[PDB]
UniProtKB/Swiss-Prot annotation:
SUPFAM superfamilies: Ribonuclease H-like
Phenotypic consequence of residue 134 to A: Loss of activity
Alphabetic keyword roster: Cytoplasm, Endonuclease, Hydrolase, Magnesium, Metal-binding, Nuclease
Protein name (database record): Ribonuclease HI
Family affiliation: Belongs to the RNase H family.
Length: 151
């Protein structure tokens, strides 16, 4: 029986673009672990992706993950865009480079190390953990200590 883990994520800027942060929650056997970091300058989209990436890269072994996020950006990427992007050497249809390809590749690599069940949520309403992730993001964005070199 594989390890079952629940992951919740969210991320954003105090002002987009500008200071930003991510927030993630890993829950296993009724125990939760917080994840958060802030960047001097980034975008909402990047923070939305980073949250998922960091949470997944935290898993030290192959797990069954139930990732819940209200990020339309992440949803579209995983459901639709990533598939076509890889078939074109990570390029859009209109010849154009995939934005934040550095993060997308990183995410794609992390997803492959686990069996993931994506849960696209509408928003914070009815989703306590995701709202909490947003708060962790804000706190981090208020005192960012990292630089988003990929931005």
């Amino acid at each position: 029986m594989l390890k079952r883990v629940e992951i919740f994520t969210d991320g954003s800027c105090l002002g987009n673009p500008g200071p930003g942060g991510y927030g993630a929650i890993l829950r296993y056997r009724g125990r939760e672990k917080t994840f958060s970091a802030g960047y001097e300058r980034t975008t909402n989209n990047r923070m939305e992706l980073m949250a998922a990436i960091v949470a997944l890269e935290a898993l030290k072994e192959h797990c069954e993950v139930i990732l819940s996020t209200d990020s339309h950006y992440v949803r579209k990427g995983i459901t639709e865009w990533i598939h076509n992007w890889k078939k074109r050497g990570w390029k859009k249809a209109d010849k154009k480079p995939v934005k934040n390809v550095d993060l997308w590749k990183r995410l794609d690599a992390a997803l492959g190390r686990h069996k993931i069940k994506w849960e696209w949520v509408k928003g914070h309403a009815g989703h306590p953990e995701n709202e909490r992730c947003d708060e962790l993001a804000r706190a981090a964005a208020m005192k960012p200590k990292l630089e988003d070199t990929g931005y």
